[PDB]
């Protein structure tokens, strides 16, 4: 008989261990075994 007020929050609490993928030397490739 009592409907709770569904608030709109979503706690996440999850660190992603910040990235290190932009320093490296960069070259796109094609079909494998280059």
């Amino acid at each position: 008989f009592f409907t709770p007020q569904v608030l709109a929050l979503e706690v996440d609490c999850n660190i992603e261990c910040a990235s290190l993928l932009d320093l490296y030397g960069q070259i796109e490739v094609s079909r494998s075994t280059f």
Binding site: G25, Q26, I27, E28
Partner: protein, 38 residues
């Protein structure tokens, strides 16, 4: 005028590397062009 932001930045991120002075034609093409004059 010029937006200076073209969608041709796909290739500098990985596919290419800045400041390297790459050649415009592969050597195989150069030699192929050479003997094609003979």
């Amino acid at each position: 005028p010029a937006p200076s932001a073209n969608p041709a930045k796909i290739f500098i991120r990985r596919f290419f590397s800045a400041g390297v002075a790459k050649n415009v034609v592969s050597y195989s093409n150069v030699m192929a062009a050479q003997r094609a004059m003979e």
